[PDB]
Amino acid sequence: NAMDSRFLPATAFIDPEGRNRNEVERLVQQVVDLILAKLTGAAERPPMPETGPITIPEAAATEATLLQAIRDMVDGSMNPANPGYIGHMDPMPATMAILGDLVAAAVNNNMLSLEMSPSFSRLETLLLRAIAGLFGLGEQAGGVLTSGGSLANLQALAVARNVAFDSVEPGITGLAQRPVIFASEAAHTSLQKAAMLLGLGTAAVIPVRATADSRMDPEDLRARIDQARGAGQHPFCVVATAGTTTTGNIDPLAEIGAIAREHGLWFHVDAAYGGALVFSERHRWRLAGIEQADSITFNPQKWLYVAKTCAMVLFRDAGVLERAFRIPAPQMRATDGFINLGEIGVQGTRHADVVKLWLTLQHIGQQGYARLIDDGYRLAERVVEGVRQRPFLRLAGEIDTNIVCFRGEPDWLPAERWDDWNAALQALLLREGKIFLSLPVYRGGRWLRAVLLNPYTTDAVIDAMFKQIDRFAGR
Amino acid sequence: SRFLPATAFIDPEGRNRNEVERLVQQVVDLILAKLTGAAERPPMPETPITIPEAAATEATLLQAIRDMVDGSMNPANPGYIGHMDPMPATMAILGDLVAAAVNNNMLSLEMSPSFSRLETLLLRAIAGLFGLGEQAGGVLTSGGSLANLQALAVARNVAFDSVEPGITGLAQRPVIFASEAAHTSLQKAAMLLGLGTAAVIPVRATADSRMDPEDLRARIDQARGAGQHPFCVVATAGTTTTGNIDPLAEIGAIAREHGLWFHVDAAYGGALVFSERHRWRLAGIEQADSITFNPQKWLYVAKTCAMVLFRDAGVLERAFRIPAPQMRATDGFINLGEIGVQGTRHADVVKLWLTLQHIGQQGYARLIDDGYRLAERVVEGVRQRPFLRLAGEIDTNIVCFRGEPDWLPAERWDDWNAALQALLLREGKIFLSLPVYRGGRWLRAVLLNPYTTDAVIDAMFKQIDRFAGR
Ligand code: NA
Ligand code: NA
Numbered sequence: 001n002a003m004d005s006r007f008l009p010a011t012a013f014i015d016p017e018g019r020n021r022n023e024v025e026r027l028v029q030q031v032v033d034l035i036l037a038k039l040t041g042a043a044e045r046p047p048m049p050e051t052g053p054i055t056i057p058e059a060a061a062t063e064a065t066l067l068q069a070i071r072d073m074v075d076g077s078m079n080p081a082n083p084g085y086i087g088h089m090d091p092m093p094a095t096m097a098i099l100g101d102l103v104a105a106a107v108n109n110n111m112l113s114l115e116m117s118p119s120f121s122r123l124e125t126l127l128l129r130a131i132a133g134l135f136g137l138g139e140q141a142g143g144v145l146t147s148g149g150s151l152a153n154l155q156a157l158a159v160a161r162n163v164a165f166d167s168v169e170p171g172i173t174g175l176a177q178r179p180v181i182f183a184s185e186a187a188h189t190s191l192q193k194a195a196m197l198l199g200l201g202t203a204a205v206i207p208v209r210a211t212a213d214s215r216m217d218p219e220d221l222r223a224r225i226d227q228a229r230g231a232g233q234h235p236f237c238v239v240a241t242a243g244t245t246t247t248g249n250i251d252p253l254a255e256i257g258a259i260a261r262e263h264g265l266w267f268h269v270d271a272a273y274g275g276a277l278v279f280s281e282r283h284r285w286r287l288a289g290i291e292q293a294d295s296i297t298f299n300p301q302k303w304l305y306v307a308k309t310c311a312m313v314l315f316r317d318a319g320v321l322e323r324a325f326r327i328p329a330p331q332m333r334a335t336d337g338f339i340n341l342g343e344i345g346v347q348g349t350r351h352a353d354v355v356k357l358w359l360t361l362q363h364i365g366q367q368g369y370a371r372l373i374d375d376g377y378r379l380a381e382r383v384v385e386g387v388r389q390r391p392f393l394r395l396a397g398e399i400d401t402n403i404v405c406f407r408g409e410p411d412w413l414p415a416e417r418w419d420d421w422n423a424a425l426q427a428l429l430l431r432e433g434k435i436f437l438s439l440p441v442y443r444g445g446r447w448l449r450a451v452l453l454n455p456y457t458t459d460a461v462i463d464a465m466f467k468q469i470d471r472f473a474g475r
Numbered sequence: 476s477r478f479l480p481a482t483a484f485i486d487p488e489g490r491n492r493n494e495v496e497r498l499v500q501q502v503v504d505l506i507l508a509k510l511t512g513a514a515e516r517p518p519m520p521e522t523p524i525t526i527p528e529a530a531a532t533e534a535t536l537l538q539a540i541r542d543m544v545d546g547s548m549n550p551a552n553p554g555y556i557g558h559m560d561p562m563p564a565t566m567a568i569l570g571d572l573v574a575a576a577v578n579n580n581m582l583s584l585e586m587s588p589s590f591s592r593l594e595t596l597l598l599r600a601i602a603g604l605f606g607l608g609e610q611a612g613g614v615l616t617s618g619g620s621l622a623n624l625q626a627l628a629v630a631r632n633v634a635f636d637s638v639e640p641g642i643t644g645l646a647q648r649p650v651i652f653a654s655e656a657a658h659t660s661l662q663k664a665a666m667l668l669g670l671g672t673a674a675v676i677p678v679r680a681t682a683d684s685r686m687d688p689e690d691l692r693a694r695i696d697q698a699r700g701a702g703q704h705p706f707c708v709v710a711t712a713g714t715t716t717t718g719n720i721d722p723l724a725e726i727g728a729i730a731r732e733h734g735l736w737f738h739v740d741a742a743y744g745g746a747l748v749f750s751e752r753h754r755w756r757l758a759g760i761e762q763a764d765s766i767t768f769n770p771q772k773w774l775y776v777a778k779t780c781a782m783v784l785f786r787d788a789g790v791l792e793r794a795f796r797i798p799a800p801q802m803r804a805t806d807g808f809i810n811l812g813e814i815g816v817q818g819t820r821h822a823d824v825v826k827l828w829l830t831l832q833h834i835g836q837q838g839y840a841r842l843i844d845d846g847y848r849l850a851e852r853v854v855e856g857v858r859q860r861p862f863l864r865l866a867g868e869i870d871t872n873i874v875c876f877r878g879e880p881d882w883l884p885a886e887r888w889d890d891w892n893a894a895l896q897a898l899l900l901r902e903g904k905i906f907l908s909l910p911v912y913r914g915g916r917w918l919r920a921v922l923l924n925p926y927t928t929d930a931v932i933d934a935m936f937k938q939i940d941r942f943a944g945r
Contacts, residue, residue: 025507040486173669350617363483368478
């Protein structure tokens with residue numbers, strides 16, 4: 001065959017009868033040893049790297065070239081494994097998440113259908129049923145894994161739209177009244193992208209006023225709904241966010257949901273980040289009201305430390321996916337009751353994320369996550385206290401998760417020079433402190449953003465951060 | 476109190492190096508054992524979930540991995556010849572190990588400084604291979620469904636200016652055209668885009684499952700007469716069931732003649748660009764407005780790996796990207812999340828780039844040749860047996876065929892072919908798929924496994940001969 005020819009490297013594939021096993025094992029071990037050396041020594045690389053030409057070669061690259069490429073890829077990539085990386089909802093991966101993706105890629109199954117993923121499709125369906133149980137959604141609840149929270153939000157909104165307008169087969173172009181959804185002004189932009197994609201347009205996402213603590217104002221929500229109907233629009237969904245992207249705040253889920261139900265609006269909870277609190281006895285009360293959601297988005301890739309991507313959309317009634325999403329096609333359900341997951345997802349073919357998810361959940365355990373979450377809050381509160389002791393600094397508001405947004409508002413500077421002050425501080429922290437904070441645009445200004453995810457971030461890192469902030473301000 | 480395993484994470488200062496090395500090695504040795512011994516497992520497997528409070532033991536995790544592999548489908552078996560799902564290239568497996576380890580995010584340049592630039596440059600080069608021109612480029616997507624979704628979204632946005640106001644105010648229903656043999660992801664995309672599944676108007680296909688240009692013309696005029704608004708034609712380069720290629724040049728010319736967006740779904744057949752001998756089959760694709768292509772299929776890249784390419788990559792900024800302050804880097808690159816359906820995204824470019832380098836264009840040309848050779852062996856085997864019938868001519872390494880025995884009434888043909896398919900798998904350890912096609916059940920051979928040989932094909936027909944009595 002081709003694998004005996006001189007046009008293929010002897011290690012292009014793994015011979016299923018072991019004829020090239022020694023050569024493969026050697027190549028595999030090269031990469032394993034290299035990557036392990038890079039990860040066990042990750043602190044040697046800064047949180048951010050210090051800075052083609054791309055041509056697809058005719059002949060096979062040498063193993064020396066392949067390994068150099070891997071080396072260059074790692075060295076030029078961001079390093080959230082560095083204890084000083086505290087700026088984004090992007091964590092160092094759990095060991096079993098890395099190993100899970102090795103397993104997933106090796107067996108290379110397809111979530112598209114049962115016969116292409118006999119074990120994984122069943123594992124995923126059962127696992128998400130259990131997880132929906134943790135959210136308190138009831139016994140009809142379930143969902144699918146998606147390649148990212150944006151897709152999860154897209155699918156929920158698609159179901160909300162289909163349920164309200166019966167649009168699976170005729171579409172929505174016939175409507176005289178514009179469909180609109182409501183969300184906090186601090187909600188994620190994937191909502192606007194979803195609305196665009198769904199044929200609603202970006203402007204169909206009506207922003208609801210958030211408080212000083214970046215939580216949705218239920219009073220304004222009700223006002224916006226009335227105003228929308230007054231404008232001849234057709235509201236059909238409300239989105240509450242459980243852990244906003246910038247400040248990590250949690251909307252008042254019960255109040256929002258009650259308003260949604262009063263007006264017959266689909267209640268979607270975007271808990272991409274904050275959804276992890278269900279593993280925390282100490283903190284899951286913060287999610288009170290989420291158990292009544294019509295749909296939930298949750299991203300284990302964030303606070304559950306699962307290697308990207310890992311996200312899901314859960315429905316309180318999983319059958320809604322067959323009634324108001326699934327395209328017309330003959331039934332092909334298996335004898336033990338499972339359905340081809342491709343039929344009820346945005347994606348068709350899909351990578352088996354369930355492997356790394358299930359393996360990581362088992363390795364760490366609920367108690368493990370409860371501990372990690374507590375440490376997150378602990379570090380966040382240390383940042384909060386440090387800011388409060390510095391009058392030239394300002395919190396964005398109360399915190400609800402392990403995220404602290406703050407900025408310098410010094411009186412030796414006029415307000416219009418604050419963005420440059422903070423941008424320079426962020427640059428200084430990274431360059432000389434090897435500490436990475438993000439600098440999002442928030443409330444028309446530039447704010448510093450701390451996301452305390454790295455389990456190897458210590459009190460000393462935070463202290464070092466403030467120590468350098470002090471010098472930049474001349475204390 | 477609550478316990479974290481010493482190997483839950485990898486200590487960046489090496490304090491748990493020895494323990495994490497041992498755990499990784501155990502999984503590596505287990506996976507390598509299963510793959511180098513994959514022929515020991517049949518193509519398909521033979522025959523409660525609670526999140527634990529406490530950390531699971533290493534023995535438990537390894538046993539779970541063992542159970543997961545043994546319970547999975549096995550395309551690495553030489554007898555797996557039924558789907559567009561191949562055994563992964565070695566560097567694709569290793570690529571995903573690398574990607575998970577560094578755990579970067581394709582959402583923005585800041586979160587994937589190397590990967591974002593590598594992907595953009597790689598897809599420019601690939602767009603060039605399709606002959607799309609100097610402005611061409613695109614993004615990797617998690618699946619060809621998303622690629623088709625994004626392409627059709629852009630087509631819609633360009634024609635109806637719908638990025639901000641949407642399409643609800645329209646009076647004429649927007650419709651697209653595709654072969655009756657085209658992929659169902661078009662219908663799902665149409666549903667998602669607010670067009671509805673019925674917006675995909677099926678165009679008659681020939682006996683060889685290729686879109687008929689004249690019927691395309693007829694359906695378009697008909698749509699306009701029925702007060703509809705055509706805005707896109709989708710040609711398919713490698714249909715899912717039979718693997719046939721639409722006449723891209725003729726379809727594209729008709730599309731451009733009617734001012735319609737021309738999208739080529741080359742999810743499978745796109746791989747032919749790496750074949751000097753066979754890429755002439757995609758003649759006409761170079762004038763497409765957009766192209767879908769899935770390296771996860773015929774380029775052996777572990778799932779997922781797919782892309783959408785645009786002849787003018789700039790159209791993503793004018794008719795897709797949502798309003799936001801621009802954040803362009805000084806070297807010209809843009810945050811990929813802004814111009815994709817997905818935001819956060821797994822770095823598929825790692826396995827794609829490593830696999831492309833390892834196999835090379837020569838390697839893919841060789842693999843593709845072998846596929847055609849095996850396919851032609853199946854076609855010849857069918858032609859020698861009057862009780863079997865070909866679905867039509869083949870264009871790629873895919874052969875769709877079925878038994879139509881005269882000792883059975885036509886209503887029993889489905890059962891005959893279903894029984895044959897089950898017999899082949901159980902007795903011969905040979906997997907063919909059995910899709911619904913033209914109202915019946917057809918056998919489907921997809922000859923992708925580099926370790927599938929003539930003997931496998933011979934054993935298949937011998938098995939077929941026994942079942943038929945011959
Ligand atoms: Na709009
Ligand atoms: Na993926």
